[PDB]
Design a protein around this motif. Structure first.
Motif, mmCIF file in Angstrom:
data_model
loop_
_atom_site.group_PDB
_atom_site.id
_atom_site.type_symbol
_atom_site.label_atom_id
_atom_site.label_comp_id
_atom_site.label_asym_id
_atom_site.label_seq_id
_atom_site.Cartn_x
_atom_site.Cartn_y
_atom_site.Cartn_z
ATOM 1 N N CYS A 109 0.850 -1.267 -0.022
ATOM 2 C CA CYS A 109 0.002 0.029 -0.076
ATOM 3 C C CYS A 109 0.971 1.226 0.045
ATOM 4 O O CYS A 109 1.645 1.600 0.976
ATOM 5 C CB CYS A 109 -0.807 0.113 1.163
ATOM 6 N N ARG A 129 -3.802 -1.189 -2.359
ATOM 7 C CA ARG A 129 -4.747 -0.425 -2.135
ATOM 8 C C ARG A 129 -3.608 1.029 -1.755
ATOM 9 O O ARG A 129 -2.785 0.774 -1.189
ATOM 10 C CB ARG A 129 -5.643 -0.187 -1.442
ATOM 11 N N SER A 132 -2.234 5.570 3.999
ATOM 12 C CA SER A 132 -2.736 6.769 4.347
ATOM 13 C C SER A 132 -2.298 8.018 3.701
ATOM 14 O O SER A 132 -2.736 9.251 4.265
ATOM 15 C CB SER A 132 -2.961 6.760 6.026
ATOM 16 N N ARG A 135 -1.340 6.794 -3.076
ATOM 17 C CA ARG A 135 -1.987 5.905 -3.797
ATOM 18 C C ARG A 135 -0.530 4.966 -4.302
ATOM 19 O O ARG A 135 0.687 5.581 -4.223
ATOM 20 C CB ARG A 135 -2.405 6.006 -5.116
ATOM 21 N N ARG A 154 -7.067 -1.154 -6.129
ATOM 22 C CA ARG A 154 -7.955 0.019 -6.164
ATOM 23 C C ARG A 154 -7.290 1.362 -6.127
ATOM 24 O O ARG A 154 -6.227 1.341 -5.261
ATOM 25 C CB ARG A 154 -9.046 -0.097 -5.257
ATOM 26 N N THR A 176 -11.527 3.333 -5.159
ATOM 27 C CA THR A 176 -11.425 3.586 -3.513
ATOM 28 C C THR A 176 -11.986 4.560 -3.066
ATOM 29 O O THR A 176 -11.524 5.725 -3.441
ATOM 30 C CB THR A 176 -10.461 3.021 -2.902
ATOM 31 N N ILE A 177 -13.345 4.563 -2.212
ATOM 32 C CA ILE A 177 -13.797 5.864 -1.837
ATOM 33 C C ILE A 177 -13.133 6.420 -0.781
ATOM 34 O O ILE A 177 -13.055 7.653 -0.544
ATOM 35 C CB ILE A 177 -15.520 5.613 -1.220
ATOM 36 N N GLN A 178 -12.110 5.641 -0.302
ATOM 37 C CA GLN A 178 -11.358 6.175 0.866
ATOM 38 C C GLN A 178 -10.086 7.040 0.392
ATOM 39 O O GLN A 178 -9.695 7.988 1.073
ATOM 40 C CB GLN A 178 -10.353 4.941 1.465
ATOM 41 N N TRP A 179 -10.056 7.028 -0.836
ATOM 42 C CA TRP A 179 -8.746 7.791 -1.683
ATOM 43 C C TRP A 179 -9.308 8.732 -2.798
ATOM 44 O O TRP A 179 -8.922 8.279 -3.930
ATOM 45 C CB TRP A 179 -7.630 7.081 -1.788
ATOM 46 N N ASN A 181 -12.188 8.694 -4.388
ATOM 47 C CA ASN A 181 -12.789 7.762 -5.428
ATOM 48 C C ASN A 181 -11.765 7.422 -6.500
ATOM 49 O O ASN A 181 -12.370 7.292 -7.498
ATOM 50 C CB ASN A 181 -14.076 8.516 -5.522
#
Length: 237
Positions: A109, A129, A132, A135, A154, A176-179, A181
């Motif tokens: 990640c 993925r 924090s 990408r 993702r 990914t909605i965390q990053w 979208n």
């Protein structure tokens, strides 16, 4: 069967030959062994976070279950190394040689894999993925003939990646909605003869990607950006 003080003393003295050494469970966080030869060494479950292992030789070494977060492995030779379930979150893997390496269940990640060679590697169920912080960057990576079945990519950036002949069965290239979208971005990538069967390519960016000869059986392609892509049949979208 070597401890921290032993290796640090030896390296400081100019020793570079650490082939076959057993360093299981050692902690070398933030430290440098740059240029060391650790071919065939046992680094299982080591704690090497934020260390400098750039330009090391780690051919056929075992780093299974090692903690390698934010490690610098730039230009290191990890040819046929074993990194099963290693934590490479946020690692610097620029031009790293990982040909035929075992990265099954590894976390990559937010790693930088720019121009890395992972030809014929095993990446079963690996996590690529975003971390924090960023990408995952696989720009210009070689993944020729690799097996990424069930891998999670993702939001990964795969500009000009080579996935020719790769197995991508059930791999997730979605948003990914965390990053932000962000979807996986395979702009200009080559996937010639790749097996993309049942892969999630929803909203994936496939602009000018080469899908010729690829298997898209059961793949989700809804809303993918296909402009200029060479389709499996050789037609241009």
């Amino acid at each position: 069967h070597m401890n921290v003080g032993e290796i640090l003393r030896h390296y400081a003295a100019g020793k570079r030959n650490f082939q076959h050494i057993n360093l299981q469970e050692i902690e070398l966080t933030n430290a440098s062994l740059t240029g060391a030869d650790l071919s065939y060494a046992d680094l299982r479950q080591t704690r090497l976070g934020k260390s400098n292992f750039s330009h090391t030789c780690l051919r056929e070494a075992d780093l299974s279950e090692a903690i390698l977060w934010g490690i610098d492995l730039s230009e290191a030779d990890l040819y046929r190394a074993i990194l099963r379930e290693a934590d490479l979150t946020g690692a610097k893997l620029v031009k790293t040689r990982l040909e035929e390496a075992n990265l099954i269940k590894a976390s990559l990640c937010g790693a930088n894999l720019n121009s890395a060679n992972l030809s014929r590697c095993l990446l079963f169920q690996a996590d690529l993925r975003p971390s924090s912080n960023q990408r995952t960057d696989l720009g210009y990576v070689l993944l020729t003939g690799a097996d990424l079945s069930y891998a999670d990519l993702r939001a990964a950036s795969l500009h000009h990646a080579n996935l020719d002949g790769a197995k991508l069965c059930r791999a997730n290239f979605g948003r990914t909605i965390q990053w932000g979208n962000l979807a996986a971005d395979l702009s200009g990538a080559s996937l010639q003869g790749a097996d993309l069967s049942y892969a999630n390519l929803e909203s994936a960016i496939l602009r000018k990607a080469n899908l010729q000869g690829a298997d898209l059986t059961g793949a989700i392609l809804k809303d993918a950006e296909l402009k200029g892509a060479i389709m499996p049949d050789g037609s241009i979208h």
